[model samples]
Target: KAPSHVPFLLIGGGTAAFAAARSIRARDPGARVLIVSEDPELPYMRPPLSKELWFSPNVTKTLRFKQWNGKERSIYFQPPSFYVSAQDLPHIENGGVAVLTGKKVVQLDVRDNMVKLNDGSQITYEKCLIATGGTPRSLSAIDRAGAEVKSRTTLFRKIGDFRSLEKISREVKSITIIGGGFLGSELACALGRKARALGTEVIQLFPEKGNMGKILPEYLSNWTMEKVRREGVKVMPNAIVQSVGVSSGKLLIKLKDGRKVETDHIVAAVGLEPNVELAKTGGLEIDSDFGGFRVNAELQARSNIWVAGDAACFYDIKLGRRRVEHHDHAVVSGRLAGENMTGAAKPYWHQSMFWSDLGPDVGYEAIGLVDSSLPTVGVFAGKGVIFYLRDKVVVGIVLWNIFNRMPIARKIIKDGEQHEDLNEVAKLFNIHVLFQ
Candidate 1:
């Protein structure tokens, strides 16, 4: 039985919602937080899904991935004991977080402070936070194709997708990955390594000239593409997938340039569509350019309602209104939302950072807007450094192969300086220093 009302209602079972729950409980000890999520599983980190899981030598039967340090870790944010039953949430003396999984919130009644679920359950709340995150975007070419092609294609995002792909990678003779962004590049390297021993072919195709072309410079992107190819992935750049069809037992991928690829499985790692439909239905302002729920500096959409994570479109003093889709942003913004819900009224001034790795050899940590269009000055050693500038003001920094220097990156972006000599600025990251 669902509770009629909860003190704190956090939507979405993701890093953001979990962080918000932790934040709320930290400040308001007696706050009964109810997390409503469509996912059957609890909150978990997604980065390792494409990075470490594929390379793990000792994956447990329960799907726990073994880290480099020989420690096995579960994907869940917390164990089952951490969350109380939904019906027991209000009854507890000290109050706790209750997760109601496999439930879809169809509409949010902002005026009444209530939410209607797909199962006809109406729940009211004192304070509400929307952290629905994003859904993996699907290609129209694959969708329009026959049922067999659709069945062979996967829009990779969730834990279930990871499980299926893991199984498929071991069994399939060949796998074709579409897109060259973070997810695609990372998965290409990951699956490529696995395919090596399994004697399977891994082909990565993308419209961009090279991997991570949208974020990294042409040189760096091309360099990464070469690196991925060295890992046994056949890199196919400037390849636009026109259509997909089934031929015999294989999925045939047709490119715009008349090139064709036949593979046992297809993984579409294009991008994500922000889960803003529920917010839009509830009369929340959605950012047209960013495709997310428009939120104030305080991460609030309304007085009693806040938005965070991939769904939030917040104002950046330096960059104007923008939305970030990363783990760090979700955690920080969600923490801020929870604090604001408790009347902290603090502005979101923190700059979030994101990192991506290509197997064990290459990795980079980035802060602020890391668009390739911005003029970048690269400082290369064994470890590389990139400073992206707009009108000579440093807007973003990428520490290639660097580790544990996010604080410096955060300070640099926050200071917002127009440096004449970027070589001196590059020294701040110590690009000469060899790091893991």
Candidate 2:
């Protein structure tokens, strides 16, 4: 049975909050933990909401907190059973721990370890962790153009967002996805798969040279462009979406240089803005550059308060002045924050790692950090790996289609070692290892 009270109160319902709760239970069994999230659903994975839900016929069935394989699905993280278990002493609620939903945190009485809710309610806590991820950056500029114009543009951030897109994709013959970031690229890939299954078309419009140009290498980006094209998804790179409106029962998108494309739907996956209003209201320091909370390496916000995941910008001790806002980074950081809540002083050092499943046949995985100066060697055309080396120390690895070598590549990246013969490493692992 859960203790009547918790020592640590965690806020937010995303992956970070759930991970932190799990980590705390693992480290300190006696400590009472309580989680409060604005989202109603039990904490489920977020990455698949964009990729799998777009193509899956039964989207609701996949919303539960578990991974499905065969006839059995196991809960990887938080489950209802775990919450009610005797060993775990905690209570979770739909509202903000003690405060109701939509009630903002007006002020944090740090000196007294209490928070004043917008409704003027106060909740005292011995320790607190803030993992209020991020909110979709509004496309107000597009919305101000007109209601009809705004209706044509959709943002794919949450499961509900994708559910709406799925409905649109079913009725529409074509879709034009704006922005070439990770979200856009994943949406394009998922949409392409869905369209191919439905015998339709998808046109991906990106302002960058290739998809996800900032992180992935040029060669990999170019190859991804070709892969999408091969999958019957038209990629329009270096193209800007100047305006969007309705024309002839279709959404007409005008390019920067006056080019136009009439499509049934327009999806924008540009990026996200941190939901820092609550943090700012609570007197937490916010980073000016990205508008995220400025959190130290320990993931602490102020005194007994801490932040993690996307909302918390963690300083990279290795890079001196760098922060990560990726999904994997959020997971590891959440784990660290949970441990720290129990007085464990472990620094967040997990290198950012992420993968995008473009299609059934194509998947890309990147580890460590991207280095533009590193010499790239493509072992195979459109299907290989790229090793990033700086000062003879392996810093990163980019793999396309080849995944068996990921374990070894990750080991090399973390160790930052130089291998004389990467081919030998490939042979030893029986996988194609490309050097870049």
**Which residue pairs clash in candidate 1?**
none
**lDDT, each prediction:** 0.88, 0.70
TM-score for each predicted model, relative to the true structure: 0.97, 0.85
Cα lDDT tens digits, model 1, 1-436, are 7799998999998999999999999989888999999999899989878977887645524657767566878878899999999999989989999999999889998999999998999999999999999998999998799788888888888888988888899898999999999999989998899899888999999999999999998888889889999999999999999999988878889999999998999999989999988865699888889999999888999978999999999988776788999999999999999999998998889888899888767888999988998888788875778888877687888888988888988888888877777777777877542111
Candidate 1 lDDT at 111 equals 95
The residue-by-residue lDDT of candidate 2 on 286-338, one tens digit each, is: 88875688888888878788898888876766533345666787788888999
> lDDT at 216 for candidate 1?
90
User: Pairs clashing in candidate 2?
Assistant: 1-86, 375-436, 376-436, 377-435, 387-436
What TM-score, to 2 decimals, does candidate 2 have? 0.85
TM-score of 1: 0.97
Q: Which residue runs of candidate 1 sit more than 4 Å off their true CA positions?
A: 57-60, 432-436
Q: Which whole-number lDDT from 0 to 100 does residue 44 have in model 2? A: 59
